[PDB]
Design a binder for this molecule. Structure first.
Ligand SMILES: *[C@@H]1O[C@H](CO)[C@@H](O)[C@H](O)[C@H]1NC(C)=O
Ligand SMILES: *[C@@H]1O[C@H](CO)[C@@H](O)[C@H](O)[C@H]1NC(C)=O
Lengths: 199, 178
């Protein structure tokens, strides 16, 4: 039930200075890659990479640290251990809670502006509250897919473990036209469709 | 190259927040160590229910990082980074339906340092209740972002503003909404 933490290594307008530390685990095809990033203000100056095996000065400001840390056999072996250690344990902790977390999307189809059925308009497909963020949104006019005229805004992260996207098609609708939004997500066995009638 | 990215990101700075420690999975913050309350705070109910975390790891890394800052202020001949102004966006959580309760999200993005003031404004006046907010989220580009939330009920005779203050901003930015 408990998460693990490796401890960072030791170095060696208003006045403000910042230091940032990052312990990243890159999980891919049953493999873990560990990166320990040391950043002063916005400049990453020194880094440990499990793929490298040793510390590397990202910029010349990290030169003393690369030189020193690499001289200590303990620091090096401690770091090298991390992928099979902390990276693996924490990945294993996240079962269907984070690794397989699935939330179904809320699809709403509505025109951009209120007006007559002849002028130029945008048909908004507002797909909201879903996880993971990997999603497909297709536009269909009278059963045939509309590829051109799709104005999408980049996938939106709500910062509450849910995502949103607005996919709007450029349309000149005729009375009796059926516009269909088709959503493909990992949290659905069968795709969800929402139809819009001209009226 | 990865299926998933699990990361611990902690910062330490002169101005407030003086320090921050958190764990994020695929850019979404899972948990953090309240450094003042000396307690682990989980982003979701189910998280803290199935998982545990030792706040001593949070604080200890903040202690290491505090030392590292001192050494680098010295090494860099007191180098202060240039103020990166934020990029503000206001958008509702769910599709807007007059009279149906919703949430207004304010995304403050692409700024440095993580020193910021954020106040919600309804019809010109400050709104203190039904308000929530994120931590100073550390972007992969060593810049920062934050989320602010306001529970609201959509009405035609209403207007919203996300009032932001940052050192790289000459006048407080107002980002208006319907
Ligand atoms: C930075 O330090 C060097 C000495 O190492 C000095 O020559 C230089 O003037 C310092 N920079 C400032 C702006 O004081
Ligand atoms: C934040 O707000 C306080 C009080 O309004 C003020 O003293 C401080 O300078 C502000 N700074 C910025 C730019 O956020």
């Amino acid at each position: 039930q408990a998460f693990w933490i490796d401890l960072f290594e030791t170095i060696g307008s208003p006045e403000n200075y910042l230091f940032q530390g990052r312990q990243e685990c890159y999980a891919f095809n049953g493999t873990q890659r560990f990166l320990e990033r040391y950043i002063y203000n916005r400049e990453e100056f020194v880094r440990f990479d499990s793929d490298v095996g040793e510390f590397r000065a990202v910029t010349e400001l990290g030169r003393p640290d690369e030189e020193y840390w690499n001289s200590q056999k303990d620091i090096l072996e401690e770091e090298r251990a991390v992928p099979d250690r902390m990276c693996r344990h924490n990945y294993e902790l996240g079962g269907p809670m984070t690794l397989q977390r699935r939330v179904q999307p809320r699809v709403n189809v509505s025109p951009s502006k209120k007006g007559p059925l002849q002028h130029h308009n945008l048909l908004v497909c507002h797909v909201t509250d879903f996880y993971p963020g990997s999603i497909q949104v297709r536009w269909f006019l009278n059963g045939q897919e509309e590829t051109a005229g799709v104005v999408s805004t980049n996938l939106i992260r709500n910062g509450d473990w849910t995502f949103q996207i607005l996919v709007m098609l450029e349309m000149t609708p005729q009375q009796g036209d059926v516009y269909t939004c088709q959503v493909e997500h990992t949290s659905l066995d069968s795709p969800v469709t929402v139809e819009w009638k001209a009226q | 190259k990865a299926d998933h990215v699990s990361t611990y990101a902690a910062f330490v700075q002169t101005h407030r927040p003086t320090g921050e420690f958190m764990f994020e999975f695929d850019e979404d913050e899972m948990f953090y160590v309240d450094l003042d309350k000396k307690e682990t705070v989980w982003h979701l109910e189910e998280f803290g229910q199935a998982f545990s975390f030792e706040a001593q790891g949070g604080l200890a890394n903040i202690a290491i990082l505090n030392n590292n800052l001192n050494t680098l202020i010295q090494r860099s001949n007191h180098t202060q980074a240039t103020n990166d102004p934020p990029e503000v966006t206001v958008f509702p959580k769910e599709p807007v339906e007059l009279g149906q309760p919703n949430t207004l999200i304010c995304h403050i993005d692409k700024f440095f340092p993580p020193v910021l003031n954020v106040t919600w404004l309804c019809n010109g006046e400050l709104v203190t209740e039904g308000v929530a907010e994120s931590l100073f989220l550390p972007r992969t580009d060593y810049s920062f972002h934050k989320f602010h939330y306001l529970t609201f009920v959509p009405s035609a005779e209403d207007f919203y503003d996300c009032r932001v203050e940052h050192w790289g901003l000459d006048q407080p930015l107002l980002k208006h909404w319907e």
